[PDB]
Amino acid sequence: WQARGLGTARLQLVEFSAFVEPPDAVDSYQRHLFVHISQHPPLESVDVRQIYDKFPEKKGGLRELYDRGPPHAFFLVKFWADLNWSGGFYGVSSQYESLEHMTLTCSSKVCSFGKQVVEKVETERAQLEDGRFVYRLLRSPMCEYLVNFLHKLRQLPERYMMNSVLENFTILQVVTNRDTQELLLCTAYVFEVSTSERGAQHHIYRLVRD
Ligand SMILES: *CCC(=O)N1C[C@@H]2CCC[C@@H](Nc3ccc(C(F)(F)F)cc3)[C@@H]2C1
Numbered sequence: 327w328q329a330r331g332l333g334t335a336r337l338q339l340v341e342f343s344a345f346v347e348p349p350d351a352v353d354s355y356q357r358h359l360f361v362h363i364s365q366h367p368p369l370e371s372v373d374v375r376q377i378y379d380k381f382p383e384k385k386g387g388l389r390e391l392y393d394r395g396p397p398h399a400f401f402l403v404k405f406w407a408d409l410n411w412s413g414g415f416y417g418v419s420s421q422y423e424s425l426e427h428m429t430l431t432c433s434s435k436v437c438s439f440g441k442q443v444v445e446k447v448e449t450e451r452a453q454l455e456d457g458r459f460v461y462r463l464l465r466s467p468m469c470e471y472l473v474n475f476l477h478k479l480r481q482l483p484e485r486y487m488m489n490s491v492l493e494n495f496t497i498l499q500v501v502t503n504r505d506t507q508e509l510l511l512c513t514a515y516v517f518e519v520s521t522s523e524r525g526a527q528h529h530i531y532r533l534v535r536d
Contacts, residue, residue, distance in 0.1 A: 328368045332530055334399050337430075337501065337510040340365055340421040340460075344468060348414040358411040359526050360476070363403070372402050374533040377514060380440045380496045386433070387442075391500065391512055392535060400533040401513045406520035409480050409488065416468040416476075422461040422501070422511075427452045429504035430461050436471065439494045444471045449504060485519060492517040 332339040344360045351357070374392055381388045392400060422430065429452070435445045446469055452459035475495075482488050501511040514533065520526060 329398060329401070329532055330367060330369060331365050332363060332401050332403065332511075332513065333365075334396075334510065336426065337422055337424045337428075338365065339363065339511070339513075340423050342418075342420045344416075344418050346411055346414050346416050348411070351414065358408065360407045360409070361405045361528065362526050363528055363530070369401075369530055369532045371534040372531040374400065374535050377402065377496075377516065377533075380494075380516070381437055381498055381514065382435070382440065382442045386435070386500065387498065388512075388514065391509065392533070394509055396509065397535065398532075399509055399511055401511075402531040402533050403513055403515050404518070404529045404531070405515060406518050406524070406527045407492075408520050408522075408524075408526040409476070410522045412477075416473045418463075418466045418468050420461075420463040420466070424452070424459050424461070424510075427454070427459050428510075430510070431502045431504045432463060433498075433500045433502075435498040435500075436469075437496045437498060440496070444469060479519075485521070488519040492519060 341364045343362045346358050348356055374388060378388055383389055430450045432448045433445060435442050437443060448463055448466065450461045450463050452461060479488055479491060482491065495517055497515040499513045499515065500509065502509055
């Protein structure tokens with residue numbers, strides 16, 4: 327009964343991307359993906375206690391949320407970001423899918439050294455498509471801390487210096503039913519840089535606890 331991708335039975339992540347389009351994409355289109363999960367054998371498990379220290383610890387960080395439950399909704403995603411590509415569009419697209427009509431509240435907490443730095447909260451409503459309800463947070467503008475972070479991260483004269491910086495940089499991402507405050511999906515993101523000739527890639531774990 328364990329999860330096999332990023333989703334419960336109540337809410338599945340269809341696709342998520344963070345991308346940049348260069349200014350000349352209006353002439354011939356071109357999209358560079360920093361990170362990408364597409365979802366059109368169990369997932370491995372990571373103890374949630376090992377990554378507690380990387381996330382905030384008062385209200386709406388990991389200890390309270392996991393003790394809130396439900397335990398099966400909690401995932402860790404490890405990203406190898408692609409960091410080779412000035413004034414283009416920096417974007418996040420998310421799609422979710424579900425069997426209910428809900429209203430989704432998506433929080434994205436960005437944490438540096440395990441304390442929250444910026445947070446964006448978005449509301450999306452179900453639109454019914456083909457017997458299933460679809461939630462489309464498409465082409466959301468990436469918030470300006472992270473765009474500035476990416477340019478300065480790219481500058482770094484070593485690739486292992488980027489991984490040192492990204493070690494203390496995490497994103498926590500909580501999706502709730504707006505009406506009823508049920509947690510549907512909590513995903514913790516930890517970050518490495520990819521090499522240039524490799525693309526972006528990801529590994530998805532379930533978060534489990536004793
Ligand atoms: C304030 C930022 C914001 O609104 N969001 C939402 C989106 C949610 C989670 C993914 C994240 N996008 C990024 C992924 C990866 C990188 C990096 F630096 F390449 F590893 C940057 C942004 C944003 C945060």
